[PDB]
């Protein structure tokens, strides 16, 4: 029942963000929510290409790094490339079929596109610092630690796409699939969406910000400066991306957009809190892997775990969740100059 | 069975364009088909924003147009906005779930994104020349003539998405859906893809080029020059877009990518020819609507129909179809300076 051009002339100003009539005409003279129009415009204004950044000195730095410092740098880079491999495609495959207002439709496609630039920038970095990029790229899919995070993150998107496919084909109700019982509930699909957005918000607002700290710690030592300039550009995009999911999550939560979402968001409250806590703990456990073979000037397991708690508290509050950790000051204030 | 990060470490250089393992890692150090990497790079190099173009004189021109010339201009603009409303979303929703090589995945997301810029540029034009843009935007969905083309074009995408949803959930075979028979065939889904790409190629390579002729005919009269500058930028993107579908269609046809596609493409040959002929006839009938109330200097029903035949022959040949019309010279050679 999904359609790439819905024939009904609907008032797009009254549609909900999600699960309404698929957007027919893409117009930009008006918005229900102008934050999405402001995010499009800002992301457009930021357009950059990786090749605009000189990464030619980073091979020298990378080779001069002690082996455990190479391990810190490349593990971090591998994790970023994993995450924006998912982010390049997943907003488009998972969110587009559900969007019912043009400004959010176009924001999501602009968001995903900006992720492909990030993915291309990671390739630009990798091929300029290692001799065999395939070894790096292949380790991303087979790395025991990396593959752990990939599973959980992608499952939020996959479960949403699968249930979407059932809902578009069958609609709500209980159905027969080769003698199996399939209960299709829009309330449940709305739950899958809200949890997915919560997971995506933790991804961009916490998981990538932990990784930014690792990259900029090298830059603080005047090393891997080409990488650091690219990460500055990525982080500036990332701030737009998390603002997007913050607004989607809060507009759903308030009931201003879908009153059914407000009560779903309350039912999901503990499960949202738990998923944020788990992601923060997973990033703490990732720090044990990053520093498995030793630490470096300005960054170690303890410092980075403090930063996880610091940033997690900020992000959870902004989407209305209680704080899981003691309130603390920024343990790495030097990171602010890069952001 | 669709996954946003497939866990198997596969050789992406050996995957097919479509229906293979979904792309896990987005890497750009290598390509199976470097045309898609070249298209990404070129489209990135072309990045433009509508607001970079001064459209401030076009309101004066538009108001000075006789009523039938306003009708020609705005009907053409309405049709373009319809078509790139579909093109902004549909490559992402319809093609992304099926792509199994990273360079094609990223090309498709870059292609769709560049379409949203076109859609935003049409909004930029509309709001600068009419007093009530809503009347324009609403007529796009309700216009009897426009809605006719929207139905057929969107059906190629919708049928492909629906069958995709059955294939990811159920896989190949015959299944029970509430006591109904559903035969899911990958060969059939491959047929839906190939016909869709043929339809999309006619869309961008013929239907939009007919509309470019209308826009540039005004520019030839030194009218609507702001519009014309935007259409120049759009047409330059369009040439990349049709090159993309040309290569997908030809690589599938050759069997170089999927040997099963080569025999499917032969079985589909007459039906591909017929769909191109129908689109050309539909564009000829659209010219009767554009010039319903009279013609203008340099462009009329007869001239535009000659251009339909001229351009249709070129596009059909490039994707290996026989020519439906007598071979003729460019009836509007002035269009070349704008392209
Ligand atoms: Fe990113
Ligand atoms: Fe992001
Ligand atoms: Fe376009
Ligand atoms: Fe196009």
């Amino acid at each position: 029942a999904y359609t790439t051009f819905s024939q009904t002339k609907n008032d797009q100003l009254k549609e909900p963000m999600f699960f309404g009539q698929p957007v027919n005409v893409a117009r930009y003279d008006q918005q229900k929510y102008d934050i999405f129009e402001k995010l499009i415009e800002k992301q457009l204004s930021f357009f950059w290409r990786p090749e605009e950044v000189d990464v030619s000195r980073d091979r020298i730095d990378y080779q001069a790094l002690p082996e455990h410092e190479k391990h810190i740098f490349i593990s971090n880079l591998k994790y970023q490339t994993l995450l924006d491999s998912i982010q390049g495609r997943s907003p488009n495959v998972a969110l587009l079929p559900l969007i019912s207002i043009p400004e959010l439709e176009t924001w999501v496609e602009t968001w995903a596109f900006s992720e492909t630039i990030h993915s291309r920038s990671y390739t630009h970095i990798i091929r300029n610092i290692v001799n065999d990029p395939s070894v790096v790229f292949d380790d991303i899919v087979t790395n025991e630690q990396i593959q752990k995070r990939a599973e959980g993150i992608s499952s939020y998107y996959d479960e949403l796409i699968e249930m979407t496919s059932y809902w578009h084909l069958l609609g709500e109700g209980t159905h027969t699939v080769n003698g199996k019982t399939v209960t299709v509930s829009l309330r449940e699909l709305k739950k899958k969406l809200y949890l997915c957005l919560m997971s995506v918000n933790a991804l961009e607002a916490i998981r990538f910000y932990v990784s930014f700290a690792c990259s900029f710690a090298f830059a603080e030592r005047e090393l891997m400066e080409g990488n650091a300039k690219i990460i500055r550009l990525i982080a500036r995009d990332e701030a737009l991306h998390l603002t997007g999911t913050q607004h989607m999550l809060n507009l759903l939560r308030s009931g201003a957009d879908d009153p059914e979402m407000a009560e779903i968001a309350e039912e999901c409250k503990q499960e949202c809190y738990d998923l944020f806590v788990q992601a923060a703990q997973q990033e703490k456990d990732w720090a044990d892997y990053l520093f498995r073979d030793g630490s470096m000037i300005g960054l170690n397991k303890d410092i980075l775990c403090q930063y996880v708690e610091y940033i997690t508290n900020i992000r959870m509050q902004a989407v209305g969740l209680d704080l899981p950790f003691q309130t603390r000051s920024n343990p790495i204030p030097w990171i602010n100059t890069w952001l």
Side-chain angles (χ1 to χ4, degrees), chain A:
Chain A
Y2 171 86
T3 168
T4 53
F5 195 84
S6 50
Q7 296 279 78
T8 284
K9 178 196 106 181
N10 64 328
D11 190 344
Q12 302 179 323
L13 297 175
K14 318 237 179 171
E15 291 289 331
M17 279 184 297
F18 299 95
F19 308 113
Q21 181 189 319
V23 182
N24 44 36
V25 49
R27 62 190 285 189
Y28 306 91
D29 56 318
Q30 59 180 25
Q31 310 78 34
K32 190 193 184 175
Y33 296 112
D34 42 67
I35 179 69
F36 298 118
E37 168 64 19
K38 293 186 279 188
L39 286 168
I40 295 160
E41 196 283 321
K42 263 281 180 165
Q43 184 73 82
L44 290 183
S45 75
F46 289 163
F47 179 73
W48 57 278
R49 297 178 66 178
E51 305 77 16
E52 304 174 350
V53 181
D54 175 23
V55 303
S56 66
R57 320 287 78 227
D58 288 20
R59 180 182 284 273
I60 287 169
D61 291 351
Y62 184 72
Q63 291 297 334
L65 296 184
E67 290 307 293
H68 70 278
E69 290 185 25
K70 292 183 171 61
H71 161 82
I72 293 167
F73 186 86
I74 211 70
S75 296
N76 187 48
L77 188 54
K78 279 187 288 182
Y79 186 39
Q80 292 171 322
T81 309
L82 164 70
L83 291 179
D84 272 354
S85 295
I86 294 183
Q87 286 292 101
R89 60 185 67 104
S90 294
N92 276 336
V93 300
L95 301 180
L96 268 187
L98 303 172
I99 290 168
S100 34
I101 61 171
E103 67 266 32
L104 181 62
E105 183 181 82
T106 299
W107 170 240
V108 162
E109 306 196 72
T110 300
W111 172 20
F113 164 72
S114 79
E115 304 286 17
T116 71
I117 304 297
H118 298 178
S119 297
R120 293 170 63 76
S121 79
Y122 298 132
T123 277
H124 188 48
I125 293 151
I126 292 170
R127 66 199 300 180
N128 273 273
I129 70 167
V130 304
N131 297 113
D132 194 340
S134 299
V135 175
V136 171
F137 287 126
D138 288 333
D139 192 61
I140 292 168
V141 180
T142 68
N143 183 288
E144 226 193 358
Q145 308 280 339
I146 294 188
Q147 203 188 13
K148 166 189 184 196
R149 290 108 179 113
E151 292 188 312
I153 293 178
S154 72
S155 66
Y156 281 105
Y157 278 120
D158 296 348
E159 297 188 327
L160 171 62
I161 294 161
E162 180 176 14
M163 197 177 287
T164 292
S165 305
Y166 286 102
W167 172 63
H168 276 149
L169 297 179
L170 295 177
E172 275 205 317
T174 294
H175 310 272
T176 294
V177 176
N178 305 333
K180 305 274 291 185
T181 303
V182 180
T183 292
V184 175
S185 161
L186 169 57
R187 218 168 177 283
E188 179 57 77
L189 182 62
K190 288 177 175 168
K191 180 169 177 170
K192 289 289 180 185
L193 170 71
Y194 190 80
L195 295 162
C196 186
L197 299 181
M198 283 279 187
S199 174
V200 176
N201 178 262
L203 186 172
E204 292 189 309
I206 299 170
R207 300 190 194 261
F208 256 107
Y209 276 79
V210 173
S211 107
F212 297 159
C214 301
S215 305
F216 295 137
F218 284 95
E220 283 297 313
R221 304 168 52 213
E222 305 190 87
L223 300 169
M224 310 304 298
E225 295 180 316
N227 178 78
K229 286 185 191 180
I230 288 171
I231 306 302
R232 284 193 79 190
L233 295 166
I234 291 171
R236 191 181 57 172
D237 295 336
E238 199 67 283
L240 301 184
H241 299 173
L242 67 94
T243 301
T245 57
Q246 280 179 348
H247 278 254
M248 299 167 206
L249 289 175
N250 285 333
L251 288 167
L252 295 167
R253 185 168 54 99
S254 68
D257 193 61
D258 180 6
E260 180 153 70
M261 268 309 200
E263 56 181 4
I264 292 170
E266 189 52 45
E267 289 175 288
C268 296
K269 189 77 177 316
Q270 186 75 67
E271 188 176 328
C272 293
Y273 181 86
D274 296 340
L275 93 75
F276 267 79
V277 176
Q278 166 176 305
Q281 182 61 45
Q282 198 172 55
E283 294 305 307
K284 289 194 189 169
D285 298 336
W286 172 247
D288 278 270
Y289 177 76
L290 289 180
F291 301 112
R292 179 193 61 200
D293 301 326
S295 67
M296 60 182 244
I297 289 290
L299 201 59
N300 54 40
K301 184 207 155 191
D302 174 66
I303 293 167
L304 195 56
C305 290
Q306 292 179 51
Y307 182 73
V308 173
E309 301 202 345
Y310 172 75
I311 203 63
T312 294
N313 271 351
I314 292 165
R315 306 311 197 194
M316 296 190 53
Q317 189 247 51
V319 294
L321 303 168
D322 299 322
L323 305 196
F325 308 110
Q326 186 144 273
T327 283
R328 230 65 73 102
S329 258
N330 194 338
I332 50 173
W334 47 262
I335 204 176
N336 299 328
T337 48
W338 303 91
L339 303 172

